[PDB]
């Protein structure tokens, strides 16, 4: 079954393709949504529901932003800005990435970024199974466009820790195209120019606006701009900083040095922000914030905006910046489509509208739109649309000097589309490396490898290689033979390849030890389950013997039964308070033969009622 | 409907009598009893479960031992016994007894332990109704045994606030007794002499002795004697205030500065008790007790064993107490049965068997066979249905007597209901009369009644013709009622005109410690306000959540099922009245009126219901194409 993933910061979204069309998969408490969240407890982990319900008492064990420390270099100059929305430890790994430090298992545990997402996704896929009772094997995973070539690796890898196949990891904006394109019957076809589509998605940490060429059938990405530091929990972090220091002014409680009362008021201050959306006034409350202080305040839409005023200052780059390299002024966009849920808000849509001069749209489910368009994706692999995303810088690859006139050569230029296939022919003297890199380092994010992936490959002797910007937007070598003299093919070489994805002995590793912590965890559930099938089993049986039961056994049956209930109880308190499955399933079965034979007895009874009845009539 | 009404200190057990046998009630999350709590809030009361939850978020407005401030003068030697265990404000009443003080919708308010009762019995009566579907009119209330005159006056009165008529206000162990009566099938019958059980209760704040005589169709109590002040409550109390000390020298914080720190200790120190009667060692952890430091130690049961010891000095004392009064040594006994929690308390039980020299049995439902007596009692009442006739007498432990005015009789005074007789009790006697006159009933012997006890119980005044011969002779009914209260029945002036003619039916006017008309009209018509406006704000509160689920549920299946059955017009339109709706739940409808919100819900539904049968007519066809 086709599954795919909106991996949010603050929710996921699945989808399946099943049956006419797509449809969103619940969580276990029935949501449509599931929070991106991993705990760790003494006997196992807290993934989604669970992680995020124990963030306050289990604080410095949960792990949530779990996309934004992908790839993450724990010098990055942005480490800070990420960094300040955590609530558990970030350290430095071997390899110079961020992981988390935790308290696990009643020892401490160090996680790499890709570990955590694997965990999550796990936990998810895990949901998609209960859902469809099906065997879950394929993904498509949604993503910022500002993620980047390694954090498409390590996303990719996390799937496969997951035990799944990234068949694709897209562009969250250009997933949500394909729902708008696959749900649109009224496009123009033919000689007709497309339609202009603008889209602006603002969610819990990023801010993108995307924009598209829409006909019958295809799209094509004209341009992609992103805000990676704009989004809901910049305007939770501000409500908060402002009520840390009004409460210790009024209260004398200083929120800050309690990372629990800290993370009270983010979390009231979420729900705040929502009615601010609607009313232009709104009260704060929140019952035992520190120290058993009930605070209590209000706060007004006109204040809020004043509290992210230097935010607000780039709340038209990402629209101008689209245009820009869509070549496209505002005048020439069509229709502006508006989802993530911090485009409710009222400032941001006043804002958008008036850059693009058009009212919005909302065509597209907010929430729904992206996951959705991951499943159709992912289906794709077993109706046709052809969708092309936009490739922002051009990636050159090189090769060895030898007897070829030139060693290296611009590949996919800036501005060009993916996926994208470029055949090329070398004249070879012997074996030799490759390498891709980018063409020109400036016009990229400041500190980037110039590098991308490197190969090694098996009077001169020509050989067609094949090199590919995959549908995931990645650079590969696809294919290396030799030519002979029109054509003919000879020899095959082995390609060695070298990029951010993992080796295949670090990745069994690594999914051997996720097996682990799974089957920990399932493991734990089910023993915590029979424990209270048993425990609920000699509270109702006891109350049907001082009922119904109680015509239905002798004196010497019912002492029986009722001291092997206070020993059953007794056992729980004692060897039965933390034990295994099979002694609670033993001392469950022990009860219930016994149990059963008075039930049985009962029922005897009650079809002779039931006769009665029918032989009055 | 007969209903019983067993009134916990900690929870109370309801049982109904009905089909061929008495059942008990169970409450709205489907438990079979029902925290006795009392919590006041901005918009309506918490009684029962949702008080108990709410009681360390509003424990200054949570109101709890409601059965022991009944009839509590604020000046009792025993108060600060009793105030130690509450977490709101208690008050001064205008009649010196003892109310609480809370803050209830906005407001200060002062409620009276009469008024507090009614509050909850009237929660419970509801809980009755809701699962029989029948009205509820009449009340069998088990009490302690300890339960003065006066408190038996207040309780019943507290009943009637609540709707409902008190048929009898039973001793609580007399009724559980009864329940084994109706039980057993082998009892003595005829001439055979009466098996001699011995019951012990003991809960959260009483520990109650009784010695019985049993014969098929019989019981007479032979004797009774508490102690009120053992119960779980003190084991519970002795083991946080243990932690109290150890967390100020372990954790530097004092939880005895911090009520809702306590509370949460309180609350976890039961459970551990517990633990205890089961286990020899018990660990103990609670997150975040105070300034979110959590705590972690242990308790032993013998640890535990020494705090309580002060209270274990006097754990024969009711059995000791209960035999001298029924004038039996421990052998003559032939059954001890123990019912009440803190009977599995392993310290308890051997003390008690020891004191007896008999193992302990558990015939009877360790919690619910004091609600069943009393329900079983309130049938043999209600002359509606029959059930085979179940005869009991309970034991006057104190002497009474009654006086009127001198006149022209030779005394003024005579007892009339000997101390160790039984009730209830029925006396006749002749008074010579020469005008209207006073009386009233008294202990003849104050000295063997507990501290400052008033010597008055009642008085009555009568208002007679003197038939011209100086001095008409009346004949007085002279009653203890069926509850164990002192009144005057019947009085009328005979005449030997005929010998035994009765001449006049007198009027009587009494003085009790039961309410006047007046003054219940008063509380029963404040209970009905405050009971109607929980009603409607729970019923608001639902139409308000049936909106909320509606536009949620509508927009999802507009996406999933609804989607074929409606046009991209339909669509919008209830795409726009959703959002709509939605901002209204922000805005003004935020806290609303209910007709706002059913009035929302149809607008939504008239245009919902057109694509709803639409899909309900195409899933009809595959059921069948
Ligand atoms: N009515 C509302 N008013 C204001 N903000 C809202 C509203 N509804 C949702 N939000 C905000 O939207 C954010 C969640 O939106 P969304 O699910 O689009 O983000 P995400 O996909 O988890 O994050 P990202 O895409 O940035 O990784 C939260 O910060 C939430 O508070
Ligand atoms: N296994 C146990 N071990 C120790 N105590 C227990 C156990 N089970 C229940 N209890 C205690 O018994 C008490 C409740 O008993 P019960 O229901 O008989 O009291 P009650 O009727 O509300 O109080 P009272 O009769 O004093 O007014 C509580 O203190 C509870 O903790
Ligand atoms: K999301
Ligand atoms: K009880
Ligand atoms: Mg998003
Ligand atoms: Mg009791």
Redo the contacts between chains.
Sequence with gaps: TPFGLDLGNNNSVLAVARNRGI??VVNEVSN?STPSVVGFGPKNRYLGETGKNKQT?NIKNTVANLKRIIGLDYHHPDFEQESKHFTSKLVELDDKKTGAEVRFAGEKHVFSATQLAAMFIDKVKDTVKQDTKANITDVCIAVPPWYTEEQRYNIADAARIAGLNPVRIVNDVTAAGVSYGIFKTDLPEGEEKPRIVAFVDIGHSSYTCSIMAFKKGQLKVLGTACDKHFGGRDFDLAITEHFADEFKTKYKIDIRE?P??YNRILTAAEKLKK?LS??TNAPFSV??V???VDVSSQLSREELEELVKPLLERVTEPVTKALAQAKLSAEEVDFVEIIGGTTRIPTLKQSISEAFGKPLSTTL?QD?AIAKGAAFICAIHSRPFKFEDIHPYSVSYSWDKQVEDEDHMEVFPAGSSFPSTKLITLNRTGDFSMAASYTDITQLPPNTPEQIANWEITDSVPVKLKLRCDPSGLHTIEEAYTIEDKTVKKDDLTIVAHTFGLDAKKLNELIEKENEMLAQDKLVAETEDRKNTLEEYIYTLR?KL??EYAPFASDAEKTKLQGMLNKA??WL??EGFDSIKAKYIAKYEELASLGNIIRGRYLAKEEEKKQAIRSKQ
């Design positions: 449809d969103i449509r008492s309690n629990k009362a009615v609607a009313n019952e035992s520190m120290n058993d489910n729904e109350g001082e009922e109880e007794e308190y004692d």
